[PDB]
Amino acid sequence: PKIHYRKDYKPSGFIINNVTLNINIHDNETIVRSVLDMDISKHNVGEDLVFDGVGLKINEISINNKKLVEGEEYTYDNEFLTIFSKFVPKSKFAFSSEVIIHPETNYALTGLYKSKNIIVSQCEATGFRRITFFIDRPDMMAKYDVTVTADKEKYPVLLSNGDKVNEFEIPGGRHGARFNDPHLKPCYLFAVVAGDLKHLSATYITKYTKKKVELYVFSEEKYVSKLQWALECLKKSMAFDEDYFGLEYDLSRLNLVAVSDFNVGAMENKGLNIFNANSLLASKKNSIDFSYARILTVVGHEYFHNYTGNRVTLRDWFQLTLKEGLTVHRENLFSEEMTKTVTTRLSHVDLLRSVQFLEDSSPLSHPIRPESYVSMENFYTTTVYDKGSEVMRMYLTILGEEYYKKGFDIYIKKNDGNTATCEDFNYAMEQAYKMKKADNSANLNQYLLWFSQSGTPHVSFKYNYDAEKKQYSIHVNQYTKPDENQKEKKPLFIPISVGLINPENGKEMISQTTLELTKESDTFVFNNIAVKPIPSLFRGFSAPVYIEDNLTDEERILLLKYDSDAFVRYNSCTNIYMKQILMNYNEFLKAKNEKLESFNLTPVNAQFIDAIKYLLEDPHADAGFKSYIVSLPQDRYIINFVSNLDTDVLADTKEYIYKQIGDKLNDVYYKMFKSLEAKADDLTYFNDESHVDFDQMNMRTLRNTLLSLLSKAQYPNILNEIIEHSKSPYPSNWLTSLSVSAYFDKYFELYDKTYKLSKDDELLLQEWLKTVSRSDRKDIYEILKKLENEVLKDSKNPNDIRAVYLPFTNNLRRFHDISGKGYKLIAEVITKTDKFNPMVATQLCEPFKLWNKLDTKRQELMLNEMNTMLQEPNISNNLKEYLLRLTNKL
Ligand SMILES: Cc1cccc(CNC(=O)N[C@@H](CC(C)C)C(=O)NO)c1C
Ligand SMILES: [Mg+2]
Ligand SMILES: [Mg+2]
Ligand SMILES: [Mg+2]
Ligand SMILES: [Zn+2]
């Protein structure tokens, strides 16, 4: 279809200086009256004036109070309004339009829409054009004066960006409010909300200027008591940006608003952040533990955009990673500091190495700054976001904390109030880098390849120790696989954070150092290394790469036990698991294909199993860490290492491994499950929505992981423990009782009990839906059909749709049924959903991303469903672009 290219970027021939809106909300229509105070830029060459405007019903068009007429001075085709150049003035002018739109039937949740009884907007990326005409792109920065009117009884709270400057009554039971947002902004940061909303509020005093900021968080009345953690997390985010970056908030007021129907997590509209209710609302008796982490990171992320996205914005959409990667990095820094648990960093690594590495070896592979797009919407990707953040975090690793803060400050100062590009950020970091090296010839020109080159680098190692010289060498190689974006791949600037562990006593042998690999290969030599070390490589996960440590399992075990760095310990464990998984996978696959009547499996390493026991029995070791060591790598991590994957054979492989370990450790697992109870489920802070003990949350996580293992093993009398756990007041515990009960006939009683506990809270019923959807059940397909008919019905709430289907698609055995019925079922949902919400339909395609990694029968089934979906008449441009790229047609 229509393809935009990065190299084709040109500034506009026009400038929009001021936007003055009247948004008049009525029962069956919203009327939008808009004045744009415009001018011609220095780049103008007498061209037609072309506005974006999608699905708008025009009442009137004028320029300087002169009415323009369809077919004579303009054309409109439901996408673009063209004003012929003859009637475009040559100096300052006022463009006026009035259009009609229909929030009430906008089920796509982009533009102006209705979520339950709340009228709300979503404008990023290209939603403003669905409200009114605009040059709808992020370099068209302007100031906004916004009046909203509505029925007073139905819509008493009216909000738009900035200072509320007047409130007034209107005949017929209506009323209005006017806002002035003094900060120049692109139109994707416009927002408006109208509803019967309740709030909590507080005053925050900024650290340096002592500015008073009123903080408001809003929801529908039913869930006002679920707003407190959000408000606290906002106070935390504000203090962190002050403390780490020196950044203060810059309006007198900041509103956060929860709505039930939202396509993603939240949105950074200036002074008016709008959230999926699942990422703003919690209470301890009606939310699982993970809701608290999600709210903290999502509130954080939107707050951090106030500088990284708002005060410094994007020149064009190809720069998305500049705000999202950098904001993800700020959010992860925030989250690591607020949680103070090593699991937080690990969880970011886990997400990258599963979901993002898969994307990066898929036909969807792109660099973090793409070269082209059809729907910009399809480039809000784990690549742009999570690889983006790892790339932004490497600057911190390379520079250190003080020179990182210096380079960041150069960036944010220089480009304040303006657009920026990835080059501008690298330029700023390069200034810091020269200062740190004390050499004005040092440069970061090689660093740009992190923005332009797709694919995951493979970093491999060889070691040599000379005992006479006490000298140790690490020889390092990097390789990125050629792909459709580059047929030849260049070496990157890869920072390798390293230590060296003495295997005799388990201690540190050097001060930690960062090796700067800039070539295809290099050898780093260390002197005064008193015995042969074991290397601790890529500490903290210091670059976004496949690590081939070339260590034995014996050396990996010593790192798991004695290394200081949590990532290296975890990764060493991960590698032991992977070696075992690939070996047994190959054993089962050969036996299956050869139709063998007998064959052998390589047992799980017995010293590894002893090391897992020793960690678990250590009462001073971290409980979150322990939950990571007893869990195999995720399926989407594993698939990155297998071509032609038989999912059945993998499910058999994983079961054998877990069985082998549990045959040794179940008694330890049980004993720990019981000993952890007192501290794990202690009710300190249970009534305090302003404080969360993350260490204690990790103890519950560990208890629940162990309970799953023991349930699946049918450990004696474990059902009793399951029934007791179902009575815990923590929903994390009592929903776990449901999933782990899948292995017993009590499942359907716990299904009904947990349903009853869940059904009167919108968000809790959604967590119940996911718990059911991921239940390890033989009858999962009949359970899905029960969810559809009894609970989902014909809901258009993306949270409901996502809750029912996505966890099921991670069921390795059932979703990949060799019949293809899983693939068919999800395809039908995608196509159904695409007729009203193209964005959500494409999110539901995620399970197909690995199609060309599967065995050839499963490839064929997925491929047939994808081509079928592509044959759907009126398929959205979103879904079509996605499926065309995914099936190697584009
Ligand atoms: C396809 C799609 C669907 C919904 C929303 C958008 C605009 N994106 C947006 O607000 N992105 C979030 C990311 C989400 C996972 C929450 C963001 O970074 N907000 O700051 C897009 C582009
Ligand atoms: Mg319309
Ligand atoms: Mg996150
Ligand atoms: Mg609902
Ligand atoms: Zn963001």
Swiss-Prot record:
Q: Name one GO cellular component term.
A: vacuolar lumen
State where a peptide binds.
Answer: E124, G265, A266, E268
Principal localisation: cytoplasm
Q: Where in the cell is it found?
A: Cytoplasm
- Cofactor note (record): Binds 1 zinc ion per subunit. Also, can use Mn(2+), Mg(2+) and Co(2+) with less efficiency.
Q: Share what the entry says about its subunit structure, partners included.
A: Heterodimer of the p68 form and the p35 form which are derived from the p120 precursor.
Name the UniProt record assigns to this protein: Aminopeptidase N
* Native organism: Plasmodium falciparum (isolate 3D7)
The residues of the intact protein that this chain contains are 196 to 1085 of 1085
